[model samples]
Target chain A: MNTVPFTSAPIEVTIGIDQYSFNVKENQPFHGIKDIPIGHVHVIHFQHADNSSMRYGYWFDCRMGNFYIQYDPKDGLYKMMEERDGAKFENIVHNFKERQMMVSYPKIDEDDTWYNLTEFVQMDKIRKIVRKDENQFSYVDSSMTTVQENELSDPAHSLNYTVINFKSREAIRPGHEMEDFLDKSYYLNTVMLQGIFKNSSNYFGELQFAFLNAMFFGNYGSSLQWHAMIELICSSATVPKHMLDKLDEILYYQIKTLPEQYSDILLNERVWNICLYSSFQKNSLHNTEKIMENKYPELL
Target chain B: GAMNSSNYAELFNNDIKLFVDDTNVYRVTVHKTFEGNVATKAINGCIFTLNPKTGHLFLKIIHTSVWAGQKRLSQLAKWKTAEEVSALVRSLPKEEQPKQIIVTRKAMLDPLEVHMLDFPNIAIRPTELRLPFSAAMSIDKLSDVVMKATEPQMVLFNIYDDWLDRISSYTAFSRLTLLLRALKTNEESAKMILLSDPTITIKSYHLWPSFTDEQWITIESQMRDLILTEYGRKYNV
Candidate 1:
């Protein structure tokens, strides 16, 4: 089996996982959807990243949903923090606390963020403020300039906002919580399916194209089909020891079965996404080739 | 009672064959017939031993009737008041009658009262045993018992089907098998891989863990449905 290794480079891109973005520069005001530079919106630039793209990120928070993107490092984290009014952050923390049931941190790296990330008390600050303020409230940012209750509150709908903590110069979503989140069967199944299908030999380029096209154009039922193919590949009877060529054939056959519009796209984009996604996780990409060296000595 | 003819028949390991015309009796050994009659052949005289292990006494008599039937039976078979079947059995000598008996209560039976009798197994008892005797003896009481024993299994099967049907093919199963293999070998990546899938969410089943007799039927139903939907159409008449 020619296993490929995932490379975590200086730059990677990720979609919004927990909130839109985070602030890299301390004391900088967060960016909202309206504030983000036109091309810098993570979704817009998802497919736009390339070798020239200097920043890469994997958003591993359930609050934002499983997301990944690649972009320029110069774009900065301040905007990422500002994209949503901390709704996604609330979701992430809420889900974590509910699943954990207690205040103790888990041993897993992704879940152990309690030590490095904000404390539960800090995360619960918004709820505390809401309970205290029946009608109106005012609070200042870390900078300590008074922002009025009217700016933050509304009878129709109002958001309680706070900047709980800061992360800088580090891959944002790694730790016990992130790992536990990824360890979820749904996410891992998707990852494994994509890996097996995309990393077949040097054919990754084609597989990536196919996957991206299917995702963009395919209807709801496509997911069912993808799941079906994954099921077949994941079966115990399927030969797992053989790599490259066998995997290539599997992907090639499955991709061929897709609708005509998706055939080319699945070939091209899925590989790209797999490569990009794996690069951030620092995993083995050995089975990356379409054919193992021993299997096809004549070709070499 | 001193020259107990019933006890004499019991000694021969035979069902008492009786032809009673105003008290002149002919006792014979009963034999099972191909026509589904238990008295097809008459042996001269043989003693019968009711083997408790193979006989009715030791085994649990699970009443298979629906709630409605149980309710009707309960209404007709009130405690201390022998119904037709009970009356007939009561007339028979104790040694000659089949030993083990099932008394399925109606659905509306006061669960607490029913359970308090040291019934050995506590199924869903609807209410506490403190209810009035009339309420406890309601025909609906028996109906409830039958439903309680079967309903949970049905609900679980339905939920299982909902999930299994949605899974289009063997992909999820294959992934899970790989995950199980990984766990067996204690591979961290495999464990990580296993962690990635959705946790199977059938809580009641999880609580009970193993499938009960009712659940086995449901599983068979699902298997049949799968076969019928996918493979049945292709079969030749």
Candidate 2:
């Protein structure tokens, strides 16, 4: 086959604290709104046909309780769900805009269209737990999950995944260190994906892009996607040598250039201020030197 | 200030050599020779000329910083004073000679700048010289300046001092790669020489500790590959 087969299996996600579960098929979108009380814990379990699966725990908030369903290549099947009533969404959207402008060589989509749960779960915020399995787990979501042998047929089921389990008051907030990590990870991964897509016309390139798009959206989830991409690329026999070389070039460029770009920004600011500051100080020194010269003309 | 008798005697004892060619080209060689065992011992500075013939080397051993440990003192001083060196060059016979003066050491620019004021007829090419680390002048910029030479010339990089310590291994590797890239595009007239002190031992990879041993080896191999592929001209110096 020219292209690698990319498929997602149906998953049952249950938000345990409220005792709610909903069925979400592969690639299908889900939306829900329920009058859930504040501090109500919602444990989300993405159960595949096999025993292995992924879980996300989110505490409910009065103002901001929303979830968006998207297939993450790294974390297999996943969704963006917020627990606390903070400016998390605003920060993410703003940060995304800023990041897009930093590198312009590989143009990204200009359309500002993405799954915004705020718009969809309007008026009455309905938090729905999509459950697609009969298997039950503990109240507290385990940070790790293992996939069974039977689920290997499904690409998503075969991949291991992790989620940000917002257990404590501090971890509940969305747009903090986690947001920055996810943004940087996504940016780097996307640049590589774009580079590959631009250079290659094979189905493998398309498969890789789809895989990356699904998995590389968030911080905790994107690690799986990185491994998956590497595995897929390594296993592929049809990939051109030039394409592999291009991959190496893009990755090395990202590592070398990004750090330098950050350093340049900091250095420029510091150098400009110090240079400007020093000129005034030096002028004062010169004035003092002139005074001293005049006072000791005989010694000179 | 004029040189006093005692200062002149000291300078004569300092092993400062000055020679003038038949064409009125003046050469000044300063030796910073040190004696005896010491933790940090070095000989620095250059043997350089002003506006020599087109065929003659513009500057030889432009600048050197050699570290010698636990060695006896040389009968001569390691180097002449920069002030005296500049003064002696300024005191040379004046004629409407060639105005061009090529300086290898960036540090030489300031003292030479003062000397140039007295001799308006002389002009220093690349008016601003930058210390390697202080300014963002990479090997690429150095190569650009080297390429600007109108006649045949040899650029020597003496790897014998703390200069290597100033740059990381990765930076050194990139600089060398850039230098190779620069040399690749140049004509046969331009040459490069790498001078090493026999007493001072240094592993090529030790200069860049940031890189792992394997990575350094790979880089060194790549550098050798590039040299073998692109550079084949014999040394003119």
Candidate 3:
């Protein structure tokens, strides 16, 4: 039988009612998790000796170096990762179930063919499995078992801690492919998504703001990609007012030098005003006010 | 996408002069940027009068072609008449039960090389924000026709003062991004620095925007010097 994978570095983790330190790589909070039912995923908000806080999805399986959890509806626990296809419904279930964490590798690529790693290949480790009724018969865990030498505490003496009794809503995913973001990708480094708004939501306004914020220093990437993002937001929701306010300033500067240059429609025009009937929300005047107030208060 | 021309009418460097002479009724006048010359009287322009009961704004045109003659070439000649007609329109039957009165104007019949005005009023629905093809404006009845399409209330000449609801105040977002930068630099130091430099913390919300400690942690920071000062001050200040 295959044994459990252990990290060379053991950080403090809470399992069951007791606290234990286990070895697993700790990094930033996993912002890229797909919409899993909440709490089925718990962030290991680890407090470091440095008096700093860092986190990772508790279900982040260090063995695969990725996250893996399947929220089983009937029992209400993130159990059984791999046994797909008892039927076609099972396949679809797995298909939908699989997207919960947008890890680098596709679902089919993992070993064990059935994805039966269970809770063993764990990180944001959960020690105590849920016990339903007061008089009800409970599940399995052997605390009596002793910690082994090469192993990380004898295959976890009876579901230790990490109590994540998920609440009502589904968690927010990072972003869909259309938004140019997908979490848990094997290839994406932290810096690629750095300096960008991480707290995106289902709200179009927030996502719209995130895209605009990326180019705040402007020229971050392609105008076409930027155009795609804005055109999408434009078609879906009205551009936020501050951007609309900024649009006039952008247009005036651009229009003065390149009025003859750009005969076509400006991208931000589509964003700033949902309707062609819209005008600049007085960009020149507002910019002037800011310049006077900030730059040359004496002039005023 | 069609001819990136004026959707309503035309727009100019100047806006349709909308002010109240002594009353709240919108006085519509144009300057040289609109009227083509420095004429004192509005030989070409319209008045936007509000129907007090209906909350509707009515357009009343003023032009020298219709109101002025070679003999009545005086600028004040037509302006006084326009002021009188506008005053008349505003004073419709306010007594007892009101009957619908059609305020109509008949300028020269099929007139000179003149103009045409389609759709007298606007009940805006929706569309894209387009810049009117900026071209030189003309004098005469043409100016009246041009002014007809511009109503700041709708998306016409005036593009400003639109979008009353701003996206949620993203105050200190730069502070947030930079805070995130410092956080990325060193989490503990970021916190230590942020403790000193409450840029994303103290006035973070408008007092206005309280953030939970978790939210406060998540909000980005900027200015390393501030963070450094905050660290030093957390010890000293």
Candidate 4:
């Protein structure tokens, strides 16, 4: 399943303590879609740095659903703040806040900006924000002058995003009320299934393809078919197993492919998706697959 | 009421059996039956995949009717209500029936329901305190009960030639055995891989569905069109 990323990366089912994803790094540009908890929207080249689009970002608050601040090292104490005056306000209801972090210095070797992050309450004057007495310094980036929300090429839909507190430099994950978003079991099943089928072609578009072949080719109506399917999945399922109820009804895989470093990130981070919908299709085979495929091809 | 009966014949496949042995007032034994008369049985099947959720698929074996619950989207794929069947049959004009005269379908009734309706006076309520109803009490004793049922000599998977396309098999037992190359040896030999399990459910005898005599004749008035009473037909014939 690993190749290039399609629309977005598959969500991990679980996140381990203090681990991170290899793909999510410092200074990677905003390219494809954000694996938000809900409502998927692909961002444009929202910010430009080092002559190309070289800024990645985070939503200050997931419920905010609109405002995002891109990370740019070149900008001293300020970066792009984008908010969607989205036609659908209901999609982003309730009080929202914007948060950002910018540095007063250049890209020095062995220097961590977040540890020394200073904020500009306004004019490029950097205020060194600090932690209360744990001797840790902190700077909270509040809203300053705002930029127009990039007009979406396909603005018809949106995704509910998440606020990722870095476990390490390599990944992003749930902050505060964030765990309320990821569906762990669904991601675990996806990761586990991908490990078994191995080859992408071997994974048919549907759930019925897995065990039905046992009965269809073996016996006309043997009782062993259902058990066979489950056993096939069970033997390969990793540590801390998951039991899927009413499996007869759970009939499809949410993802067809995983991006290049997905397994590294998943095995490392222990993260998972927020919504089951992003992780599965109830029936119509290529339903979500098309949504990702249609957009990712254009971006790629 | 001191209810007593010498033979508990009606309760055979209804999930319970009772008798007196040695010094016991009654010996209570319970088991699940793979016998055809319990409910639905498969006639034909196919294997295919058509989705994105689990990346897996299943063997879709079409069976005789079971009461498909009202799951709107889920039931939409396979459910056929009795009302829908009867209405469709009556909708056609007199001479416009399709060529094949297989009973379009049949609905099943359980042994308990049949026993209650037939011998109403003698009944064993499921909630009765004397007998245990837990799944622990009634379990898979398939091996012991395998050869217990009186099985038919021949089972026809399909009687209509048109249905062979749907089931992907020939009509009768012998024909299907001949058509499929995987059958290890003689169809009648119990040692054959096909009959390795005495309770092999794939065999129509162990897992077929049937209607009461009255329901069959009433619902299948179309069977009247045949030259004689429609004792099922062979597709190739």
Candidate whose TM-score is highest: 2
Instruction: State which candidate, 1 or 2, has the greater lDDT.
Output: 2
Instruction: Return whichever of 2 and 4 wins on TM-score.
Output: 2
Could you give me the TM-score of model 4 versus the true structure? 0.16
Interface RMSD for every prediction, one decimal? 27.5, 29.5, 27.6, 27.5
Candidate 2 docking class:
incorrect
> Residue by residue across B91-200, what tens digits does model 2's lDDT show?
45554243444443434443344433445445443322221221112223233433354433334333212324555433443454343343443422112222122333
Provide the overall lDDT of each model, using Cα atoms, as 2-decimal numbers: 0.27, 0.31, 0.28, 0.23
Worst 10 residues of 3 chain B by lDDT: B108-117
lDDT over C-alpha atoms for residue A196 of model 1: 32
Write the residue-wise lDDT of candidate 1 on A149-169 in tens digits.
343233332222211111111
Tens digit per residue, CA lDDT, model 3, B154-191: 11221111111322112232233354345444556555
The total of clashing pairs for model 4 equals: 37
The superposed Cα distance between candidate 2 and the true structure at residue B175, in angstroms, equals: 23
lDDT per residue for candidate 4 within A1-300, as digits (tens), equals 000111111221111100112233233321222233222111111222322222222212233234333333455322224345654322322211111111111224574321111110111111111112221111221111111121212222111011111121112121211121122222223433445434222222112321221111221111122232333332222313112322322322212222333323211111111111222222222333254344333222
User: How do all models score by TM-score?
Assistant: 0.14, 0.18, 0.17, 0.16
Model 2 chain B worst lDDT run, 10 consecutive residues: B18-27
Off by over 4 Å in 1: A1-45, A49-79, A82-262, A265-300, B1-237
TM-score winner, 1 or 4: 4
